[PDB]
């Protein structure tokens, strides 16, 4: 919900126009298995929900924001860098899972269209190219194992190459 | 590997001096067999016997490293060519692949658009 | 490093007896274990039954290593303090030798792969 | 919390009566192994700190749990052996295994390079005594001499390396302190600085060269096939390579390039020899070279994928190869010669063990994902980003890994055993227990090995 | 009461040894008290209880 | 000839005498050792232990980051213009030259 893209609206309605035979055997079984064990499992789920009654709140995810970046903290010091290294690592763990959501958005694009797939969508493939390219050039993907000090050097390497290209052109 | 036809009824002496030598083959065979037969058909044995032919077989491969190879001949240097040789062979394979890859990153981009790995 | 304003005869200086001594330290207990260990293998070389349950001259073995070890640790607490004190006083007197550098976000090369 | 229960396992064996011994050493180690799985599995955002540096913490170490798991497993295997020996020597021996595990707890927990190294070399002395005494075969002294000749000549160069780095840059001690790291500028003086740090872990992590350290220690086994599990722990004991390459030298890895190439032929040519050899233990000993060569290939690439595969392989090999040595132990205790050709025939005498032979041999191959496939597949996918040609070399290894397992099976599937009058009794209750306690943790790690392959995963 | 002390003289030492390790490593928290309430990461002004982080 | 060395020992009982045993010497202690205390470590550390291997130790923010990312996707798409990634750690920092 909300974060998931999902389909706009589901169609499909029963026609049953050609022939009689024995109607639709799948629809006849759909009404049969709805009361056979689908109704029994729904009654058992309702009985388990009623038996819960009192439940724990659980305050979900903790905040903890900013605490000064590694770029702001000039000169090497163990007391200052430690909290900056934790801040970068927490962002890197989130940025890994941001890609995974858009990855699952592309998974939804393949199924919910089926026949078209490549010809349609147009937004999910474009959003994937906007994030992955930003992830590849900024958040490691070339800077080996994760390090906060190496990321600042990687950001400076991209900035120096861009400034040399902009001044020439 | 066998070169001509499969050797079984081909090239043999027609009952000459080889017949006396062929009879000697069964004499040594039965000599090792009879001592095996005596140490087999008793119920009070319980345990796998030695058999010195298989003990010396393991000793031929595991040991005999430095008692042998004391004349380090030109054949050992030919074996060394198959030793160090292949290790230096890939040095002109992996480096040529790397210099092909690294030059494609900097000038004339060949990097993948959807490469989040590594 | 080397001795300057310190003299021999009586191992602690007594003039610099300001720092607190080691009281029930884990370092004292490990030498106490060695004092017990010396009271285990004495019944092994000289043939005596059971290293754990034997003759009770082991109380001398425990006390001796604790007694010598206490003054040895007192020498450790003294000498490490003096070595640190002469180090701090050298920076405070000269000042020009020890230079301070602060605030830098210098550019460094980034490694590939 | 892991200091002074293993030290409290020391007086347990001495104080206990002659009728007991084995009942106390195993039961008071299984509950200690329960507490390791209870407490060490917790992680925050990054690496924690349990205490001040006597024993530090865990960053990417579920390998500590494996040693605690083998803490009673070695005592399980050495039951038929050391049953006819002196009761005072039984008390002497178990304490030597405990002392090995004592320093092994220390080395994995301590996040130092100085305290780690001296306790890394403190595992060498107990193993020396364990190999050179109770050795069933002759010339066991060559297995003892070369154990300290190959290792110490490579590891004493760490004293001239590690102290040199801390004299220049701050101190190595706390490791999480060591982020003052300056990039190595690739100079001729820095050439031997990199080599001395690596060569110490080029011996215990067997390459193609300097690899004779391993098979001699296994052929001239410490005890039949029981104390070989400690030598499996020494193979994974070269985990300092994960820490040295990451922290001490990240920039200069041009010298790593020939060492991957040296270990690349330490994959094919080490597997080729492991096809004809007569000793059943040596057919595990040379296969253990190739599976541990995978890590040496992985680490020197330094890509994030390789670390995921390596840390998995350290745990994978520690429970699969050791299980294979337990199968070699069960065959040696009956025949008393480790000849593969002589000991031929399962199911006719050993019906239940044959299924355990399968669950141990096929794990050398990439089965339905246990930890070995998860270990190997990430490394092969990491080598492609390094260079495209690698899978041609790596693919040959995938063929000979089948020539590891099936050749061990076929030479035991051939139903004959004509000369054998022994092996009348199938298996003891503790004998089949070794087969279960090695394989069932691998079977439980099929479901979710998230807490196994974890360097920031 | 009388037979348990002679038969299980060593059987009590190992779990009690764990308790000794459980207590000694816990007491190391007082040695590391610098920036317990300080350093902005999980810092919050506690009122009903003194020293939240150990 | 050695006159002292020739004294070989070969005795593997297994089934002959104790009938049902895991190890030699004392059958009453053997049942209590090979079948009881070995199996209590086989039961507690493997079944009750498995509820600690992967079953609920939280474990390095694996499930925490899912609730963290989902609220950040909706936040920077509705209010912000870039899709959660553009520049890493350094917004207008000190330049190289």
Coordinates of N, CA, C and O in Angstrom, one line a residue, chain C:
Chain C
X1 N 63.0 8.1 28.4 CA 63.6 6.7 28.1 C 64.5 6.3 29.2 O 64.1 5.6 30.2
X2 N 65.8 6.7 29.2 CA 66.8 6.3 30.2 C 66.7 7.2 31.4 O 66.0 8.2 31.4
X3 N 67.3 6.7 32.5 CA 67.2 7.4 33.8 C 68.0 8.7 33.8 O 69.2 8.8 33.3
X4 N 67.4 9.7 34.4 CA 68.0 11.1 34.5 C 68.1 11.6 35.9 O 69.2 11.7 36.4
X5 N 66.9 11.9 36.5 CA 66.9 12.5 37.8 C 66.4 11.4 38.8 O 65.6 11.7 39.7
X6 N 66.9 10.2 38.7 CA 66.6 9.1 39.5 C 67.8 8.3 40.0 O 68.8 8.1 39.2
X7 N 67.8 7.8 41.2 CA 69.0 7.1 41.8 C 68.6 5.7 42.3 O 67.4 5.5 42.6
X8 N 69.6 4.9 42.4 CA 69.4 3.5 43.0 C 69.3 3.5 44.5 O 69.2 4.5 45.1
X9 N 69.3 2.3 45.1 CA 69.1 2.0 46.5 C 67.6 2.3 46.9 O 67.2 3.4 46.9
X10 N 66.9 1.2 47.3 CA 65.5 1.1 47.5 C 64.7 1.4 46.2 O 64.6 2.6 45.7
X11 N 64.1 0.4 45.6 CA 63.6 0.4 44.2 C 62.5 1.4 43.9 O 62.7 2.1 42.8
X12 N 61.5 1.6 44.7 CA 60.6 2.8 44.5 C 61.3 4.0 45.1 O 62.0 4.0 46.1
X13 N 61.1 5.2 44.4 CA 61.7 6.4 44.7 C 61.3 7.1 46.1 O 62.1 7.9 46.6
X14 N 60.1 6.7 46.5 CA 59.5 7.2 47.7 C 59.1 8.7 47.7 O 58.1 9.1 48.3
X15 N 59.9 9.5 47.0 CA 59.6 11.0 46.8 C 58.5 11.2 45.8 O 57.7 12.1 45.9
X16 N 58.4 10.2 44.8 CA 57.3 10.2 43.9 C 56.3 9.0 44.2 O 56.2 8.1 43.3
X17 N 55.8 9.0 45.4 CA 54.8 8.0 45.8 C 53.4 8.4 45.8 O 52.5 7.9 46.5
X18 N 53.1 9.4 44.9 CA 51.8 10.0 44.7 C 50.7 9.1 44.1 O 49.6 9.1 44.6
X19 N 51.1 8.3 43.0 CA 50.0 7.5 42.3 C 49.5 6.3 43.2 O 50.3 5.8 43.9
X20 N 48.2 6.0 43.1 CA 47.6 4.9 43.9 C 48.1 3.5 43.4 O 48.2 3.3 42.2
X21 N 48.4 2.6 44.4 CA 48.9 1.3 44.1 C 47.8 0.4 43.6 O 46.6 0.7 43.7
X22 N 48.2 -0.8 43.0 CA 47.3 -1.8 42.4 C 46.6 -2.5 43.6 O 47.2 -3.2 44.4
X23 N 45.3 -2.4 43.6 CA 44.4 -3.0 44.6 C 43.5 -4.0 44.0 O 42.6 -3.7 43.2
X24 N 43.7 -5.3 44.4 CA 43.0 -6.5 43.9 C 42.9 -6.5 42.3 O 41.8 -6.8 41.8
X25 N 44.0 -6.2 41.7 CA 44.1 -6.2 40.2 C 44.1 -7.6 39.6 O 44.5 -8.5 40.2
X26 N 43.5 -7.7 38.3 CA 43.6 -9.0 37.6 C 45.0 -9.4 37.2 O 45.3 -10.6 37.0
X27 N 46.0 -8.4 37.2 CA 47.4 -8.7 37.0 C 48.0 -9.4 38.2 O 48.9 -10.3 38.1
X28 N 47.5 -9.1 39.4 CA 48.0 -9.7 40.7 C 47.5 -11.2 40.8 O 48.1 -12.0 41.4
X29 N 46.3 -11.4 40.3 CA 45.6 -12.7 40.3 C 46.3 -13.7 39.4 O 46.3 -14.9 39.7
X30 N 46.8 -13.3 38.3 CA 47.5 -14.1 37.3 C 48.8 -14.6 37.8 O 49.2 -15.7 37.5
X31 N 49.5 -13.7 38.5 CA 50.8 -14.1 39.2 C 50.5 -15.0 40.4 O 51.3 -15.9 40.7
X32 N 49.3 -14.8 41.0 CA 48.8 -15.6 42.0 C 48.5 -17.0 41.6 O 48.6 -18.0 42.3
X33 N 48.0 -17.1 40.3 CA 47.8 -18.4 39.6 C 49.1 -19.1 39.3 O 49.2 -20.3 39.4
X34 N 50.2 -18.3 39.0 CA 51.5 -18.8 38.8 C 52.2 -19.3 40.1 O 53.0 -20.2 40.1
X35 N 51.9 -18.6 41.2 CA 52.3 -19.0 42.5 C 51.6 -20.3 42.9 O 52.3 -21.1 43.6
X36 N 50.4 -20.5 42.5 CA 49.7 -21.8 42.7 C 50.3 -22.9 41.7 O 50.4 -24.0 42.1
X37 N 50.6 -22.5 40.5 CA 51.2 -23.4 39.5 C 52.6 -23.9 39.9 O 52.9 -25.0 39.6
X38 N 53.4 -23.0 40.6 CA 54.7 -23.4 41.1 C 54.5 -24.3 42.3 O 55.4 -25.1 42.7
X39 N 53.3 -24.2 43.0 CA 52.9 -25.1 44.1 C 52.2 -26.4 43.6 O 51.7 -27.1 44.4
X40 N 52.2 -26.6 42.3 CA 51.6 -27.8 41.7 C 52.7 -28.7 41.1 O 52.6 -29.9 41.3
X41 N 53.6 -28.1 40.4 CA 54.7 -28.9 39.8 C 55.9 -29.3 40.7 O 56.8 -30.0 40.3
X42 N 55.9 -28.7 41.9 CA 56.9 -29.1 42.9 C 56.6 -30.5 43.5 O 57.5 -31.2 43.9
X43 N 55.3 -30.9 43.4 CA 54.9 -32.2 43.8 C 55.0 -33.2 42.6 O 54.7 -34.4 42.7
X44 N 55.4 -32.7 41.4 CA 55.5 -33.4 40.2 C 57.0 -33.9 40.0 O 57.3 -35.0 39.6
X45 N 57.9 -32.9 40.2 CA 59.4 -33.2 40.1 C 59.8 -34.0 41.3 O 60.4 -35.1 41.1
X46 N 59.6 -33.5 42.5 CA 59.8 -34.3 43.7 C 58.5 -35.1 43.9 O 57.4 -34.5 44.0
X47 N 58.6 -36.4 43.8 CA 57.5 -37.3 43.7 C 56.6 -37.3 44.9 O 56.9 -37.9 46.0
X48 N 55.4 -36.6 44.8 CA 54.4 -36.5 45.9 C 53.0 -36.7 45.3 O 52.8 -36.2 44.2
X49 N 52.2 -37.5 46.0 CA 50.8 -37.8 45.4 C 49.9 -36.6 45.4 O 49.8 -35.9 46.3
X50 N 49.2 -36.5 44.2 CA 48.2 -35.5 44.0 C 48.7 -34.0 44.1 O 49.0 -33.5 45.2
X51 N 48.8 -33.4 43.0 CA 49.2 -32.0 42.9 C 48.2 -31.0 43.6 O 48.6 -30.0 44.2
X52 N 46.9 -31.3 43.5 CA 45.8 -30.5 44.1 C 45.8 -30.8 45.6 O 45.7 -29.9 46.4
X53 N 45.8 -32.1 46.0 CA 45.7 -32.5 47.4 C 47.0 -33.2 47.8 O 47.2 -34.5 47.6
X54 N 47.9 -32.4 48.4 CA 49.2 -32.9 48.9 C 49.7 -32.2 50.2 O 48.8 -31.9 51.1
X55 N 50.9 -31.8 50.2 CA 51.5 -31.1 51.3 C 51.2 -29.6 51.2 O 51.2 -29.0 50.1
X56 N 51.0 -28.9 52.4 CA 50.6 -27.5 52.4 C 51.7 -26.6 52.7 O 51.7 -25.8 53.7
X57 N 52.8 -26.7 51.9 CA 53.8 -25.6 51.8 C 53.5 -24.7 50.6 O 54.3 -23.8 50.3
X58 N 52.4 -24.9 49.9 CA 51.9 -24.1 48.8 C 51.5 -22.7 49.2 O 51.5 -21.8 48.3
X59 N 51.1 -22.5 50.4 CA 50.8 -21.2 51.0 C 52.0 -20.2 50.9 O 51.8 -19.0 50.8
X60 N 53.2 -20.8 51.1 CA 54.4 -20.0 50.9 C 54.6 -19.6 49.4 O 55.1 -18.5 49.1
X61 N 54.3 -20.6 48.5 CA 54.4 -20.4 47.1 C 53.4 -19.3 46.5 O 53.8 -18.6 45.6
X62 N 52.2 -19.2 47.1 CA 51.2 -18.2 46.7 C 51.6 -16.8 47.2 O 51.6 -15.9 46.4
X63 N 52.0 -16.8 48.5 CA 52.4 -15.5 49.1 C 53.6 -14.8 48.6 O 53.6 -13.6 48.4
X64 N 54.6 -15.6 48.2 CA 55.9 -15.1 47.7 C 55.8 -14.4 46.3 O 56.4 -13.3 46.1
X65 N 55.0 -15.0 45.4 CA 54.8 -14.5 44.1 C 53.9 -13.3 44.1 O 54.0 -12.4 43.3
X66 N 53.0 -13.2 45.1 CA 52.1 -12.1 45.4 C 52.9 -10.9 46.0 O 52.7 -9.8 45.5
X67 N 53.7 -11.2 46.9 CA 54.6 -10.2 47.6 C 55.6 -9.5 46.7 O 55.6 -8.3 46.6
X68 N 56.3 -10.3 46.0 CA 57.3 -9.8 45.0 C 56.6 -9.2 43.8 O 57.0 -8.1 43.4
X69 N 55.5 -9.8 43.4 CA 54.6 -9.2 42.3 C 54.0 -7.9 42.6 O 53.8 -7.1 41.6
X70 N 53.7 -7.6 43.8 CA 53.1 -6.4 44.3 C 54.0 -5.2 44.1 O 53.7 -4.1 43.6
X71 N 55.3 -5.4 44.6 CA 56.3 -4.4 44.5 C 56.8 -4.2 43.1 O 57.3 -3.1 42.7
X72 N 56.8 -5.3 42.3 CA 57.1 -5.3 40.9 C 56.1 -4.5 40.1 O 56.5 -3.7 39.2
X73 N 54.8 -4.6 40.4 CA 53.7 -3.8 39.8 C 53.8 -2.3 40.3 O 53.3 -1.4 39.6
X74 N 54.2 -2.1 41.5 CA 54.5 -0.8 42.1 C 55.6 0.0 41.4 O 55.5 1.2 41.2
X75 N 56.6 -0.8 41.0 CA 57.7 -0.3 40.1 C 57.2 0.0 38.7 O 57.7 1.0 38.1
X76 N 56.2 -0.8 38.2 CA 55.6 -0.6 36.9 C 54.7 0.7 36.9 O 54.8 1.4 35.9
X77 N 53.9 0.9 37.9 CA 53.1 2.1 38.0 C 53.9 3.4 38.2 O 53.4 4.4 37.8
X78 N 55.1 3.2 38.8 CA 56.0 4.4 39.0 C 56.7 4.7 37.7 O 56.6 5.9 37.2
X79 N 57.3 3.8 37.1 CA 58.2 4.0 35.9 C 57.4 4.4 34.6 O 57.9 5.3 33.9
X80 N 56.2 3.9 34.5 CA 55.4 4.3 33.3 C 54.8 5.7 33.5 O 54.6 6.4 32.5
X81 N 54.6 6.1 34.8 CA 54.2 7.5 35.1 C 55.3 8.5 34.8 O 55.0 9.6 34.3
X82 N 56.5 8.2 35.2 CA 57.7 9.1 35.1 C 58.1 9.2 33.6 O 58.4 10.3 33.2
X83 N 58.0 8.1 32.8 CA 58.3 8.1 31.4 C 57.3 9.0 30.6 O 57.6 9.7 29.7
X84 N 56.0 9.0 31.1 CA 54.9 9.8 30.6 C 55.1 11.3 31.0 O 54.9 12.2 30.2
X85 N 55.6 11.5 32.3 CA 55.8 12.8 32.8 C 56.9 13.6 32.1 O 56.7 14.8 31.9
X86 N 58.0 12.9 31.8 CA 59.1 13.5 31.1 C 58.8 13.8 29.7 O 59.4 14.6 29.0
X87 N 57.9 13.0 29.1 CA 57.4 13.1 27.7 C 56.5 14.4 27.6 O 56.7 15.2 26.7
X88 N 55.6 14.6 28.5 CA 54.7 15.7 28.6 C 55.4 17.1 28.9 O 55.1 18.1 28.3
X89 N 56.4 17.0 29.7 CA 57.2 18.2 30.1 C 58.2 18.6 29.0 O 58.5 19.8 28.9
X90 N 58.6 17.7 28.1 CA 59.4 18.0 27.0 C 58.7 18.8 25.9 O 59.3 19.7 25.3
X91 N 57.4 18.5 25.7 CA 56.5 19.2 24.8 C 56.2 20.6 25.3 O 56.1 21.6 24.6
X92 N 55.9 20.7 26.6 CA 55.5 22.0 27.3 C 56.6 23.0 27.3 O 56.4 24.2 27.3
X93 N 57.9 22.5 27.4 CA 59.1 23.4 27.5 C 59.5 23.9 26.1 O 59.8 25.1 26.0
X94 N 59.7 23.0 25.2 CA 60.2 23.4 23.8 C 59.1 24.0 22.9 O 59.3 25.1 22.3
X95 N 58.0 23.3 22.8 CA 56.8 23.7 22.0 C 57.0 23.7 20.5 O 56.1 23.4 19.7
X96 N 58.2 24.1 20.0 CA 58.6 24.3 18.6 C 58.8 22.9 17.9 O 58.6 22.9 16.7
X97 N 59.1 21.9 18.7 CA 59.4 20.6 18.2 C 58.2 19.9 17.7 O 58.1 19.3 16.7
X98 N 57.1 19.9 18.6 CA 55.8 19.3 18.3 C 54.9 20.3 17.6 O 54.6 21.3 18.2
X99 N 54.6 20.0 16.4 CA 53.8 20.9 15.5 C 52.4 20.3 15.4 O 52.2 19.1 15.3
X100 N 51.4 21.2 15.4 CA 50.0 20.9 15.3 C 49.5 21.2 13.9 O 49.7 22.3 13.4
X101 N 48.7 20.3 13.3 CA 48.0 20.5 12.0 C 46.6 20.1 12.2 O 46.3 19.0 12.6
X102 N 45.7 21.0 11.8 CA 44.3 20.9 12.0 C 43.5 21.4 10.8 O 43.9 22.3 10.1
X103 N 42.3 20.8 10.6 CA 41.3 21.1 9.5 C 41.9 20.9 8.1 O 42.5 21.8 7.6
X104 N 41.6 19.7 7.6 CA 42.0 19.4 6.2 C 41.0 18.4 5.6 O 40.6 17.4 6.2
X105 N 40.6 18.7 4.4 CA 39.8 17.9 3.5 C 40.5 17.7 2.2 O 40.0 18.2 1.2
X106 N 41.7 17.1 2.2 CA 42.6 17.0 1.1 C 42.1 15.9 0.1 O 41.6 14.9 0.5
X107 N 42.4 16.2 -1.2 CA 42.0 15.3 -2.2 C 43.0 14.1 -2.3 O 44.2 14.2 -2.2
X108 N 42.4 12.9 -2.4 CA 43.1 11.6 -2.5 C 42.6 10.8 -3.7 O 41.4 11.0 -4.1
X109 N 43.5 10.0 -4.2 CA 43.1 9.2 -5.4 C 42.2 8.0 -5.0 O 42.3 7.5 -3.9
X110 N 41.3 7.7 -5.9 CA 40.3 6.7 -5.7 C 40.7 5.5 -6.5 O 41.0 5.6 -7.7
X111 N 40.6 4.3 -5.8 CA 41.0 3.0 -6.4 C 39.8 2.4 -7.1 O 38.6 2.5 -6.7
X112 N 40.1 1.8 -8.3 CA 39.0 1.1 -9.1 C 39.0 -0.4 -8.7 O 40.1 -1.0 -8.5
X113 N 37.8 -1.0 -8.7 CA 37.6 -2.4 -8.4 C 38.0 -2.8 -7.0 O 39.2 -3.1 -6.7

